């Protein structure tokens, strides 16, 4: 690995709460970023240091930040987050 691997404590528990095969897919998408993590195509919208990988069929995703100083892919979020039902359900407090 060129870049080391780091995970947010919450994210550790996040991969545990999702499907076993789902986490393994994410892991293989991680081995490729650990070589070259700056995948500008997958850049986030607002955070230039963060990128999103997603599973085409599984629907799960992973968000990581590329830390050059410590040379590490720091995965911050793991699981399902989206656009669709974020608008659909929206809120549960103030309508």
């Amino acid at each position: 690995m060129a870049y080391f691997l780091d995970f947010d404590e919450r994210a550790l528990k996040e991969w545990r709460k999702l499907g076993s095969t789902v986490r393994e897919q994410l892991k293989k998408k991680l081995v490729e970023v650990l070589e070259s993590p700056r995948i500008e195509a997958n850049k986030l919208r607002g955070m230039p240091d963060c990128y999103k990988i997603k599973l085409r069929s599984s629907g799960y995703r992973l968000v990581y930040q590329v830390i050059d100083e410590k040379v590490v892919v720091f995965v911050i979020s793991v699981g399902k987050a989206e656009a669709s039902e974020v608008y659909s359900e929206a809120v549960k407090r103030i309508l």
């Binding site: 607002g46 720091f74 656009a83």
Partner: protein, 33 residues
Amino acid sequence: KQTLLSDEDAELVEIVKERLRNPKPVRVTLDEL
């Protein structure tokens, strides 16, 4: 062209910055996962 990034990103930005302020990174490898 249309952006590769979308309205999903609007949610991912709030999640990432949330945890980012105090996530507690654990140094690991993929083999041990």
